[PDB]
């Protein structure tokens, strides 16, 4: 189970991310071409490792790509609320002065509300209610 | 191209993360069951989406999981340095009060160094500079 062009796959990841600084590249564009890299590499490497998969259905291979990419997306969205729960658990009083949370909480709620909108997974603002 | 038990896949993710606070669970453990979640869900969802792949049989499907998991790990390692370079670029003065970076910088270098150690990818702390 070795990857097809693993050394070259690692470079493509760096470039996708490096293009945020080297070019003005939307966070959302990079997310998409990272999933393309990962999904593509999974199909490349499976063709290499399975004679039987190579034998099959270029239809199957485009579907594997589409599925793997969809999974990555849905995985990241699934991680957002538990993450907020973790963050909110760390900054909620007594861990922070409740007067201090009056200021801090809305800052983080706002920060994560940006992520909620970029990832199109809106989450209740009640997590931060206290 | 729908996922197999999408609502239930979202839950396995949360539990993997929620176990960071409860159980005081190892970071290496949580990251691993995350790649197993994703790798497993890719195989599950392709059984659902493609008729022939459901027909392909066990030899191929376990290889897919192995490959998918491997691709995820290598993707993370290739992304860590370019990611640090992005984070550092974003929070380095003037972007932040340089007195504020004095407090903030060492927190995130340590934060990222936790990840460096788990994945056996050390990166110079020089990236956080002045
Ligand atoms: Na929200
Ligand atoms: Na380091």
Residue numbers in the entry:
A (entry chain B), B (entry chain A): 46 to 175
Quote from the publication:
Cell-traversal protein for ookinetes and sporozoites (CelTOS) is unique among traversal proteins as it is essential for traversal of malaria parasites in both the mosquito vector and human host and is therefore critical for malaria transmission and disease pathogenesis. Even though CelTOS is critical during cell traversal by malaria parasites and is a leading transmission- and infection-blocking malaria vaccine candidate, its function remains unknown as it has no sequence similarity to proteins of known function. Additionally, microinjection of CelTOS into Xenopus oocytes results in membrane damage. Together, these results demonstrate CelTOS is the only known apicomplexan protein with universal inner leaflet cellular activity as it addresses phosphatidic acid found specifically on the cytoplasmic face of plasma membranes, and disrupts these membranes to enable the exit of apicomplexan parasites through diverse vector and host cells.
The mechanism by which CelTOS enables the traversal of apicomplexan parasites through cells within the mammalian host and arthropod vector has been elusive because CelTOS has no sequence similarity to proteins of known function. CelTOS forms an alpha helical dimer that resembles a tuning fork. The dimer has a large buried surface area of 3003 Å2. Two N-terminal helices (α-helices 1 and 2) of one monomer pack against the C-terminal helices (α-helices 3 and 4) of a second monomer to form the dimer. The outer surface of the CelTOS dimer is mildly hydrophilic and masks inner hydrophobic surfaces created between the two tines of the CelTOS dimer and the dimer interface. Strikingly, CelTOS resembles class I viral membrane fusion glycoproteins and a bacterial pore-forming toxin with roles in membrane binding and disruption. The C-terminal helices of CelTOS show structural similarity to HIV-1 gp41 and Mycobacterium bovis ESAT-6, and the N-terminal helices show similarity to Hendravirus fusion core; Nipahvirus fusion subunit core. The dimeric nature of CelTOS may serve as a chaperone-like function to retain CelTOS in an inactive state prior to membrane binding as the dimer masks the inner hydrophobic faces of CelTOS.
